[PDB]
Amino acid sequence: DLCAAPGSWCQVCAETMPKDSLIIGVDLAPIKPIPKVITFQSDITTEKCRATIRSHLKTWKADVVLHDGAPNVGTAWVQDSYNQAELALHSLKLATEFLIEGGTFVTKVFRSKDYNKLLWVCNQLFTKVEATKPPSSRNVSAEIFVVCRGFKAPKRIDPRLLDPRSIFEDLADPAPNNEARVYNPEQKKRKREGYEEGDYTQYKETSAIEFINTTDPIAILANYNKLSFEQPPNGDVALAALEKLPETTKEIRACCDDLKVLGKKDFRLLLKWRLRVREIFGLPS
Amino acid sequence: RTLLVAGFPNVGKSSFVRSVTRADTPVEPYAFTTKSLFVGHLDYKYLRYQVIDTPGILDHPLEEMNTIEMQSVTALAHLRAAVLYFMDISEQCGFSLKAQINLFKSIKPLFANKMVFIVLNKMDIKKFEELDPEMQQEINDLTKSGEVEILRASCATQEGVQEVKNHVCERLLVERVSQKLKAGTHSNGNIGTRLQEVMARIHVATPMDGTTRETFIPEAVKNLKKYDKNDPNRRVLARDIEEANGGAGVFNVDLRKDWILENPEWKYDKIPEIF
Amino acid sequence: KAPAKFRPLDYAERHGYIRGIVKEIIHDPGRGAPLARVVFRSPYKYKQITETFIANEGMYTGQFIYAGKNAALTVGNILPLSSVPEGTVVSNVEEKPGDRGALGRTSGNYVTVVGHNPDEGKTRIKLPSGAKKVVPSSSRGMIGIVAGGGRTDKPLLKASRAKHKF
Amino acid sequence: EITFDKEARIEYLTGFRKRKQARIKQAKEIAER
Amino acid sequence: LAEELARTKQLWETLREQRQKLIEELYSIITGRIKDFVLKHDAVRAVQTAIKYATPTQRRQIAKELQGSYAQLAESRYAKFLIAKLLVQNDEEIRDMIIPEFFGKVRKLINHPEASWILDDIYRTVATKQQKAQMLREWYGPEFALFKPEKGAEATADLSKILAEEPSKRAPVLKYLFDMTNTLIQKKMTGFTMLHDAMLQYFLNLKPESEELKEFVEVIKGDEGGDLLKNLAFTKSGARLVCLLLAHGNAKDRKQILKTYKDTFQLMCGDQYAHMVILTAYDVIDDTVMTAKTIFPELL
Amino acid sequence: KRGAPGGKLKMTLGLPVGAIMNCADNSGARNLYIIAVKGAGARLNRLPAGGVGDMVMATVKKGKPELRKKVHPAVIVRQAKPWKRFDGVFLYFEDNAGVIVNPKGEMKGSAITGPVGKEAAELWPRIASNAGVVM
Amino acid sequence: MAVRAQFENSNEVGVFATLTNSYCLVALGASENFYSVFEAELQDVIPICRTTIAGTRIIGRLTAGNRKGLLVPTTTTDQELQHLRNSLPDDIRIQRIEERLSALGNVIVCNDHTALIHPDLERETEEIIADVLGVEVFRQTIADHVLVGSYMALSNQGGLVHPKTSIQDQDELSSLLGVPLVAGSVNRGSNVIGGGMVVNDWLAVTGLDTTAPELSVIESVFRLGEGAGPGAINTSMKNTIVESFY
RNA sequence: AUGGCCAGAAAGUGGUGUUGACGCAAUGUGUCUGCCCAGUGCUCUGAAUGUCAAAGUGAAGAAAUUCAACCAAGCGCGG
């Protein structure tokens, strides 16, 4: 029992295990002694607590690992949800150190956006998983109880699999709706997620030929600021040809200078001019 | 980085601390003027050092050392520093030269591995040469045991105070830097991280061609006179004009005073903006 | 059970001698050296000290052992390295006076002094691994062979030292 | 002998509607069967 | 790996007009995976033969291929056959590329049982006064190992002159020098010539008749005695070092020195240096009764 | 010393408690969640609100796992609600963004993405040092 | 010589000032302490101008230049531009540049002979910099920081860089620059060298929280306070830096 | 033990450690031994040719080249 602040779970065990069993409970706060229960004043996030729990387990393994804990709650519920998720993962890492093949591990997990990321850990580390939410838990509460059993017992476990950084790392950004940004640029689409890494200064330019040759013209229009006609350091003959064409009028050059102020008609005109130039240049279609 | 001053009463421990630091340690001619630990601070080679003045230790075993001198012993045992054992070649301290030797030998176990210096104070009264050869050997053979150095100083005329201070401070710095390098260098040969970062700060990059760059320093600064606030004939300065002409929030700055135009009368002109 | 630790530093042991009685010896898992359950007498209070030593080879239960500087130089007593003379086997010796024994606790090792240094008192002690060390004379040590035996199966040969050997 | 399966983690986390839709389409195909 | 090892084995069997036809042939086959070949003992027995029978261009290209991990070759238990054969043929560039990475890890390499003997023969055979010096400087303290020596003319490895320049380093350097020497003494590894050089500059710099001098002479005495005194007299610096030890030693020490000196009077007499220590021992010894009982009956 | 800036002029506050703003630094955080505003008054039912250059207390909702462990101070850098500067200019940005800053005023990151509001740059020299565009 | 001062109560001297070999720009605010510390060290050898840039007092991070030129962002007003021109002699060229990265002080570090710029700078801005400032322009990152103007202090004597700059990058920068470079801190461990110090060929002003070991390094690499201070004295005596920055 | 190993950016952070060279760790093994082949490349070593000295006396040395299946060694080894 990795967290028994009052000791209720230890008391429940002390009255239903088979005779001559072993139950050990650790907690940061002092616990009033319960008969047939071993009580620890040590913490859980310290490898000293690892050694002393080795000491009172002898060479024997462990069959069931219990975790029922929650940090201080009252700060926006975002800090509260994440800290509980990390505590669940650290309890899981402790269980992998002390549990026999086929053991059962049960954890209280607050339901949040990290709930699915922790469930994937027991999936790759155990054989059967399930969330229960017994009736005693308040219906208003977001708490849930996950039981993952059938522990595979590998020879060595990847530290990245137990590292909170690698499990709770946020997934990749989904592909932006370039069609919406081009075909409906007058919509608001409020941005609240952060900016990407590496595209600081929030500015990007390409050459006009790149817009001509690309397979995804919508992607370039919706993600770039300026389509440049500046002759490259070497000197592009296609830029010379595309600049001198009569299809590219003054209106075309105006739109290419400022892509972020364009509308529906302007974007369609750019796509039409791209198709006309591609026909001149002999591109497939 | 600490300098620890110990010795018999009335040898000049408090006078030495007052000389190098600004700690207000009483200096009086009686036996136990300093009844508690005093701390001073000095700067040497752009580093901060502590100087601790101790009450004083008599020639007794540790069992019946009273409360005052146990403050001396506790600092001697549990503080790693350079010990400055102040001796009295004369007998003005009220204790024999013999009793000072035995006291040093008795407390040497407390100096188990520290840097021990024996400084002979109050030598404006009677210096080393005016000693019988048997005593000179007894002082000398103390150095001829372990790593103890003997220095000579006088805290009344301030004759050997600075040289003793610099000598001890330099030796403390060398040993400490040696220890830091040793800790960074592990047994496997892998240089530690903190050592690696301090390597880059020592290193000075230099252009490979060995050519310098032209420096445009005017001739005027070469003949400038350093500004000093105690000089009656100093520069006027803008803050002094500010104080005489009001305060921080009352003085109004004339921003056109330093305008260099063609016709000086054109300053303080309302330049047209819109027509 | 309990770690094998010496008595705390005190005036009585460092200047006199104290009588103590052993009651039994207990084996504990994790090591082969048998612990010795001993009861001492407090010079200041009418209370018995419960401390555990390591049973050397040859001792029994029921000695009036002497703990101090001037104790009898017999097996079962402890003595500062200053008092014990040259060539004597010592076990469970102290690196410094106050660590309650650090060197030579496994089942059968011993340390023999090969020279005493009077002025600036230091005692030279040979380690079981064949190393040479110098320790303060004020340290204590258990006299005799620590129990456990089994010293006929120790292979002492090195690839490099053999090339070093003449 | 298990390691960090990066691609599997993305598949597990991103696909929840697709696995649900697969189950409903299978139950329907059972039912019509 | 199976076919690679198999085919090179046949080339190794042929080699252990036809000769150089193989060394290009084996090189092209072994081009790229040298680190694995120096790991395999059979391929280890292939390479030093190859370098011995290597054409002028081959030993350079393999050296650049071996550029990265010269130190790791020293720690490898099987690369001794190849690394010894790489050092014994004299060439000015190959001794200029072998030492720079050996530099700055002297303490670790000597502590390593197998590289310690490899670290000696490079020092004894081909090392020139510059790289010989700073390996000794690395022995004096960790400051010298990590830091490239300053613009001062004292770039040598003599304690007397470097400590004269900077007296404040007397205490730490001696402690480091004593600890490293004492650890190897307790390791019983005392057949290192560069160890004897460190011992000499240590004893020379001690003030006479000091307590630490008594500690050094006694700890030198304390051993089984059948090894350390014999090779230390065999070497150059130790032979003079032990001459001073007799001069500064006490009679009880001198009794122990000659008592350890036993049953090898034939061999050390034939050695060039160890008949200088008996040379000094003859005219500094006082106890003639033991002189006539030990050194003469085993001599005449 | 509470991190309430001094010398700040009155502007329209447009980020009340319980608002999400982007993160403009390279510290690993993407968005911040305002839960407290430094220097807020005490009036009934009024939600504390911040502005450009105002220290707030925020929690990282999405970003690097380390930054999600503790509540951080932050200085608002850009604001979508139009406000007026003393030169008579009503101006606004296209998003709400801030930077994680220690209680003294030192930025945790080393670079800022996007422009920095003039009020925030003038108030905090460290943000002014790590800014590329000031407008 | 190296001196310590604070603008109002902050040690970021580089934010509120700009020091060259021909002119000094000081922010305008409240008292006259910041102006007086600079004119106590520059007694009318070179002009000192009390200026504001774009209605701000952070002129240090908004302006860049050497003795031959000065550059200001596009948000600078005409009156603010006139104040600079009337204050400075005709041998210095002042140009207002229309660049997206308006914090010129953070994106340009320039001595008299060379300049380092933000990699994402415009090509037209690069051409103007080489013209007005009369230097050779290079695009570089200081310890993977694109704000070269804030993480490096430069003069014709030497240069400070970000404290965590690796050994190899110092060698490339020094050969590219032509002056010796050391990795150092300012204002008791701050990494923003440009924002926490200004320096020319004969004077540096840092914050009041700069430690004595740091001030010694600044003098040694910038050749100030007479003495010797070549930068080889930094390798000569090394116990303080190892003791203080370990 | 001012120690080794492991974690930790570091730590005056810890664990091992309630530990003291049998203890604590880390690398390799789970091909060993016996025999046979007109088996194998070499090192040491050995041979030959042509030279110039040789403490106011002792050793006879070195230079340059061609070389060596078996004819008392060794490093390796391969089937």
Ligand SMILES: Nc1nc2c(ncn2[C@@H]2O[C@H](COP(=O)(O)OP(=O)(O)OP(=O)(O)O)[C@@H](O)[C@H]2O)c(=O)[nH]1
């Ligand atoms: N002549 C001479 N007298 C000294 C010198 N240094 C200290 N004294 C004398 O020492 C007396 C005071 O003793 P302290 O200097 O304070 O020595 P202490 O170790 O602190 O012992 P206390 O006397 O108890 O304070 C003064 O009256 C001085 O006369 C010195 O350098 N020369």
